[PDB]
C-alpha cells in the first residue's frame, strides 16, 4: 500500500510511503541511515510522493517529477518508457535510483563520498541527508537544513 498522486502528502501518508521505501531498499543493500538521509530529501522534494509534479504542474516534463524530483522529468520518464516500466509508480522510481547507483548516474562527488559509499554509510541521517542534498539533488537553493531534521525524524519513526 502506497500513495501515488499529484498532491502534497500529510505526515501520516508520508509515513506509509517512507516505510515502504525503507523495506525495499534494505533488500538491495542500503543502510537505514542512507535510506533516511534520502527520505529526508524526498520529503522536501515531493512529500515522498512518486506521483508528484513540480508546482503540481501535471504533464510538464521540463520540470521536476517523482520522489526525488528528476529535473527535467523526461530524464526519468524517457528511461522508464524505454525500459517498459510504468513511469508513475513507486517501484519504477526506486528501480531508477538503483539503476543510478549501479551506473554512476546523477551523483556528483562534491563531498568526497561516492554514491556506492553513500548507500553503505553509517554516518548520521542528518549528515547523509546533507551529502545527498549536495551530491544528488542539487536544487537552486542549497540551504535546506530541514532535510537533515526530516532525515532524523524518519530514522526515529520507522522500523
Ligand atoms: C527551481 C529549482 O531549483 N529546481 C530544482 C532543480 O534544480 C532540481 O533538479 C536538479 O537541478 C540541477 C541543476 O539543473 C541538476 O544538476 C545539474 O545536472 C546536470 C546533469 O545533467 C549537470 O550537467 C550540471 O552540472 C548540474 N548542475 C548543478 C548546479 O549541479 C540536477 O541533476 C537536478 N536534480 C535532479 C534530481 O534531477 C530539483 C531536485 O532537487 O528540484 C527542483 O525544484
mmCIF file of C-alpha atoms and ligand atoms in Angstrom:
data_model
loop_
_atom_site.group_PDB
_atom_site.id
_atom_site.type_symbol
_atom_site.label_atom_id
_atom_site.label_comp_id
_atom_site.label_asym_id
_atom_site.label_seq_id
_atom_site.Cartn_x
_atom_site.Cartn_y
_atom_site.Cartn_z
ATOM 1 C CA UNK A 1 0.000 0.000 0.000
ATOM 2 C CA UNK A 2 1.451 3.306 -1.120
ATOM 3 C CA UNK A 3 0.154 6.795 -2.034
ATOM 4 C CA UNK A 4 0.835 7.942 -5.604
ATOM 5 C CA UNK A 5 -0.710 11.260 -6.631
ATOM 6 C CA UNK A 6 -0.090 14.843 -7.759
ATOM 7 C CA UNK A 7 -0.792 16.291 -4.303
ATOM 8 C CA UNK A 8 1.205 17.039 -1.178
ATOM 9 C CA UNK A 9 1.027 14.186 1.358
ATOM 10 C CA UNK A 10 0.282 14.593 5.031
ATOM 11 C CA UNK A 11 2.651 13.333 7.643
ATOM 12 C CA UNK A 12 0.622 10.134 8.057
ATOM 13 C CA UNK A 13 0.612 9.467 4.337
ATOM 14 C CA UNK A 14 4.360 10.103 4.070
ATOM 15 C CA UNK A 15 4.995 7.584 6.793
ATOM 16 C CA UNK A 16 3.266 4.794 4.796
ATOM 17 C CA UNK A 17 5.441 5.550 1.743
ATOM 18 C CA UNK A 18 8.603 6.052 3.778
ATOM 19 C CA UNK A 19 8.304 2.617 5.413
ATOM 20 C CA UNK A 20 7.733 1.025 2.024
ATOM 21 C CA UNK A 21 10.926 2.632 0.631
ATOM 22 C CA UNK A 22 12.934 1.589 3.657
ATOM 23 C CA UNK A 23 11.813 -2.045 3.268
ATOM 24 C CA UNK A 24 12.505 -2.044 -0.490
ATOM 25 C CA UNK A 25 15.985 -0.530 -0.392
ATOM 26 C CA UNK A 26 17.025 -2.579 2.670
ATOM 27 C CA UNK A 27 16.712 -5.708 0.445
ATOM 28 C CA UNK A 28 19.027 -4.068 -2.058
ATOM 29 C CA UNK A 29 21.919 -3.444 0.288
ATOM 30 C CA UNK A 30 21.261 0.070 1.611
ATOM 31 C CA UNK A 31 21.738 1.035 5.281
ATOM 32 C CA UNK A 32 18.824 2.542 7.299
ATOM 33 C CA UNK A 33 20.920 5.708 7.741
ATOM 34 C CA UNK A 34 21.489 6.086 3.975
ATOM 35 C CA UNK A 35 17.831 5.451 3.244
ATOM 36 C CA UNK A 36 16.687 8.001 5.894
ATOM 37 C CA UNK A 37 19.171 10.614 4.587
ATOM 38 C CA UNK A 38 17.480 10.167 1.226
ATOM 39 C CA UNK A 39 13.981 10.144 2.717
ATOM 40 C CA UNK A 40 14.706 13.496 4.378
ATOM 41 C CA UNK A 41 15.449 14.842 0.912
ATOM 42 C CA UNK A 42 12.420 13.140 -0.674
ATOM 43 C CA UNK A 43 10.149 14.759 1.945
ATOM 44 C CA UNK A 44 11.275 18.256 0.776
ATOM 45 C CA UNK A 45 11.283 17.321 -2.901
ATOM 46 C CA UNK A 46 7.898 15.618 -3.151
ATOM 47 C CA UNK A 47 6.459 14.856 0.290
ATOM 48 C CA UNK A 48 7.731 11.360 -0.585
ATOM 49 C CA UNK A 49 5.155 11.065 -3.340
ATOM 50 C CA UNK A 50 6.078 9.157 -6.532
ATOM 51 C CA UNK A 51 3.145 10.817 -8.335
ATOM 52 C CA UNK A 52 4.130 14.445 -7.748
ATOM 53 C CA UNK A 53 4.928 17.006 -10.399
ATOM 54 C CA UNK A 54 6.875 20.177 -9.540
ATOM 55 C CA UNK A 55 4.392 23.007 -8.752
ATOM 56 C CA UNK A 56 1.676 20.334 -9.159
ATOM 57 C CA UNK A 57 2.063 21.090 -12.864
ATOM 58 C CA UNK A 58 0.908 17.697 -14.244
ATOM 59 C CA UNK A 59 2.319 16.845 -17.672
ATOM 60 C CA UNK A 60 5.086 19.408 -17.707
ATOM 61 C CA UNK A 61 8.034 17.133 -18.473
ATOM 62 C CA UNK A 62 10.555 20.017 -18.477
ATOM 63 C CA UNK A 63 10.096 20.381 -14.716
ATOM 64 C CA UNK A 64 10.573 18.011 -11.725
ATOM 65 C CA UNK A 65 8.735 14.735 -11.211
ATOM 66 C CA UNK A 66 8.588 11.958 -8.627
ATOM 67 C CA UNK A 67 10.257 11.113 -5.326
ATOM 68 C CA UNK A 68 13.488 12.987 -5.900
ATOM 69 C CA UNK A 69 12.134 15.475 -8.488
ATOM 70 C CA UNK A 70 14.098 14.271 -11.514
ATOM 71 C CA UNK A 71 14.515 17.548 -13.475
ATOM 72 C CA UNK A 72 13.781 17.557 -16.356
ATOM 73 C CA UNK A 73 11.189 14.863 -15.647
ATOM 74 C CA UNK A 74 11.954 13.479 -19.079
ATOM 75 C CA UNK A 75 15.433 12.378 -17.554
ATOM 76 C CA UNK A 76 13.375 9.708 -15.744
ATOM 77 C CA UNK A 77 10.248 9.277 -17.823
ATOM 78 C CA UNK A 78 12.274 8.584 -21.016
ATOM 79 C CA UNK A 79 14.107 5.857 -19.025
ATOM 80 C CA UNK A 80 11.012 4.198 -17.680
ATOM 81 C CA UNK A 81 9.336 4.322 -21.131
ATOM 82 C CA UNK A 82 12.471 2.859 -22.754
ATOM 83 C CA UNK A 83 12.616 0.157 -20.008
ATOM 84 C CA UNK A 84 8.945 -0.801 -20.377
ATOM 85 C CA UNK A 85 8.152 0.278 -16.815
ATOM 86 C CA UNK A 86 5.177 2.417 -15.872
ATOM 87 C CA UNK A 87 6.651 5.824 -15.006
ATOM 88 C CA UNK A 88 4.077 6.856 -12.352
ATOM 89 C CA UNK A 89 4.870 4.091 -9.947
ATOM 90 C CA UNK A 90 6.742 3.693 -6.664
ATOM 91 C CA UNK A 91 8.815 0.638 -7.703
ATOM 92 C CA UNK A 92 9.703 2.139 -11.089
ATOM 93 C CA UNK A 93 11.188 5.185 -9.353
ATOM 94 C CA UNK A 94 13.067 3.001 -6.816
ATOM 95 C CA UNK A 95 14.389 0.975 -9.758
ATOM 96 C CA UNK A 96 15.671 4.207 -11.320
ATOM 97 C CA UNK A 97 17.562 5.058 -8.159
ATOM 98 C CA UNK A 98 19.111 1.576 -8.066
ATOM 99 C CA UNK A 99 19.999 1.974 -11.759
ATOM 100 C CA UNK A 100 21.715 5.287 -10.908
ATOM 101 C CA UNK A 101 23.862 3.719 -8.132
ATOM 102 C CA UNK A 102 24.827 0.872 -10.474
ATOM 103 C CA UNK A 103 25.688 3.099 -13.441
ATOM 104 C CA UNK A 104 27.151 6.097 -11.538
ATOM 105 C CA UNK A 105 24.492 8.425 -12.825
ATOM 106 C CA UNK A 106 23.103 11.574 -11.149
ATOM 107 C CA UNK A 107 25.667 11.724 -8.363
ATOM 108 C CA UNK A 108 28.483 14.262 -8.450
ATOM 109 C CA UNK A 109 31.151 13.686 -5.847
ATOM 110 C CA UNK A 110 31.291 17.072 -4.050
ATOM 111 C CA UNK A 111 31.722 15.779 -0.516
ATOM 112 C CA UNK A 112 34.419 13.072 -1.013
ATOM 113 C CA UNK A 113 31.734 10.365 -0.946
ATOM 114 C CA UNK A 114 30.749 8.235 -3.975
ATOM 115 C CA UNK A 115 27.151 7.020 -4.449
ATOM 116 C CA UNK A 116 28.413 3.466 -3.615
ATOM 117 C CA UNK A 117 29.953 4.705 -0.369
ATOM 118 C CA UNK A 118 26.768 6.580 0.428
ATOM 119 C CA UNK A 119 24.414 3.611 0.382
ATOM 120 C CA UNK A 120 26.627 1.655 2.805
ATOM 121 C CA UNK A 121 27.300 4.539 5.158
ATOM 122 C CA UNK A 122 26.506 4.568 8.878
ATOM 123 C CA UNK A 123 27.132 8.288 9.302
ATOM 124 C CA UNK A 124 24.134 10.058 10.858
ATOM 125 C CA UNK A 125 20.883 10.528 8.863
ATOM 126 C CA UNK A 126 21.425 14.317 9.192
ATOM 127 C CA UNK A 127 24.959 14.131 7.699
ATOM 128 C CA UNK A 128 23.871 11.761 4.944
ATOM 129 C CA UNK A 129 20.854 13.988 4.204
ATOM 130 C CA UNK A 130 23.203 16.903 3.600
ATOM 131 C CA UNK A 131 25.563 14.825 1.439
ATOM 132 C CA UNK A 132 22.650 13.544 -0.631
ATOM 133 C CA UNK A 133 21.338 17.153 -0.984
ATOM 134 C CA UNK A 134 24.714 18.322 -2.284
ATOM 135 C CA UNK A 135 25.666 15.354 -4.417
ATOM 136 C CA UNK A 136 22.423 14.068 -5.887
ATOM 137 C CA UNK A 137 19.627 16.676 -5.678
ATOM 138 C CA UNK A 138 21.479 19.958 -6.181
ATOM 139 C CA UNK A 139 18.481 22.402 -6.185
ATOM 140 C CA UNK A 140 18.876 26.142 -6.984
ATOM 141 C CA UNK A 141 18.667 26.808 -3.259
ATOM 142 C CA UNK A 142 21.299 24.738 -1.382
ATOM 143 C CA UNK A 143 20.308 25.941 2.120
ATOM 144 C CA UNK A 144 17.685 23.459 3.274
ATOM 145 C CA UNK A 145 18.825 22.243 6.729
ATOM 146 C CA UNK A 146 15.312 20.968 7.319
ATOM 147 C CA UNK A 147 16.244 17.985 5.126
ATOM 148 C CA UNK A 148 18.569 16.738 7.920
ATOM 149 C CA UNK A 149 15.837 17.342 10.546
ATOM 150 C CA UNK A 150 13.489 15.282 8.376
ATOM 151 C CA UNK A 151 16.084 12.515 7.925
ATOM 152 C CA UNK A 152 16.481 12.206 11.668
ATOM 153 C CA UNK A 153 12.657 12.199 12.061
ATOM 154 C CA UNK A 154 12.313 9.215 9.690
ATOM 155 C CA UNK A 155 15.214 7.294 11.307
ATOM 156 C CA UNK A 156 13.415 7.552 14.696
ATOM 157 C CA UNK A 157 9.859 6.921 13.478
ATOM 158 C CA UNK A 158 10.290 3.996 11.035
ATOM 159 C CA UNK A 159 11.291 0.381 11.694
HETATM 160 C C1 LIG B 1 13.879 25.766 -9.387
HETATM 161 C C2 LIG B 1 14.737 24.626 -8.908
HETATM 162 O O1 LIG B 1 15.594 24.752 -8.029
HETATM 163 N N1 LIG B 1 14.504 23.463 -9.488
HETATM 164 C C3 LIG B 1 15.001 22.307 -8.788
HETATM 165 C C4 LIG B 1 16.022 21.596 -9.662
HETATM 166 O O2 LIG B 1 17.145 22.432 -9.871
HETATM 167 C C5 LIG B 1 16.477 20.294 -9.005
HETATM 168 O O3 LIG B 1 16.962 19.451 -10.028
HETATM 169 C C6 LIG B 1 18.395 19.487 -10.148
HETATM 170 O O4 LIG B 1 18.809 20.581 -10.948
HETATM 171 C C7 LIG B 1 20.225 20.657 -11.071
HETATM 172 C C8 LIG B 1 20.567 21.945 -11.823
HETATM 173 O O5 LIG B 1 19.967 21.945 -13.105
HETATM 174 C C9 LIG B 1 20.787 19.401 -11.746
HETATM 175 O O6 LIG B 1 22.210 19.459 -11.658
HETATM 176 C C10 LIG B 1 22.847 19.530 -12.954
HETATM 177 O O7 LIG B 1 22.855 18.273 -13.577
HETATM 178 C C11 LIG B 1 23.466 18.206 -14.853
HETATM 179 C C12 LIG B 1 23.438 16.745 -15.260
HETATM 180 O O8 LIG B 1 22.755 16.698 -16.487
HETATM 181 C C13 LIG B 1 24.908 18.709 -14.847
HETATM 182 O O9 LIG B 1 25.333 18.888 -16.192
HETATM 183 C C14 LIG B 1 25.063 20.021 -14.084
HETATM 184 O O10 LIG B 1 26.439 20.225 -13.848
HETATM 185 C C15 LIG B 1 24.281 20.028 -12.763
HETATM 186 N N2 LIG B 1 24.226 21.357 -12.187
HETATM 187 C C16 LIG B 1 24.421 21.594 -10.892
HETATM 188 C C17 LIG B 1 24.196 23.007 -10.424
HETATM 189 O O11 LIG B 1 24.774 20.733 -10.086
HETATM 190 C C18 LIG B 1 20.324 18.122 -11.047
HETATM 191 O O12 LIG B 1 20.587 16.984 -11.854
HETATM 192 C C19 LIG B 1 18.828 18.157 -10.738
HETATM 193 N N3 LIG B 1 18.480 17.079 -9.812
HETATM 194 C C20 LIG B 1 17.747 16.018 -10.185
HETATM 195 C C21 LIG B 1 17.363 15.040 -9.102
HETATM 196 O O13 LIG B 1 17.384 15.783 -11.343
HETATM 197 C C22 LIG B 1 15.298 19.527 -8.389
HETATM 198 C C23 LIG B 1 15.819 18.438 -7.465
HETATM 199 O O14 LIG B 1 16.467 18.979 -6.335
HETATM 200 O O15 LIG B 1 14.423 20.358 -7.639
HETATM 201 C C24 LIG B 1 13.857 21.373 -8.434
HETATM 202 O O16 LIG B 1 12.899 22.063 -7.656
#
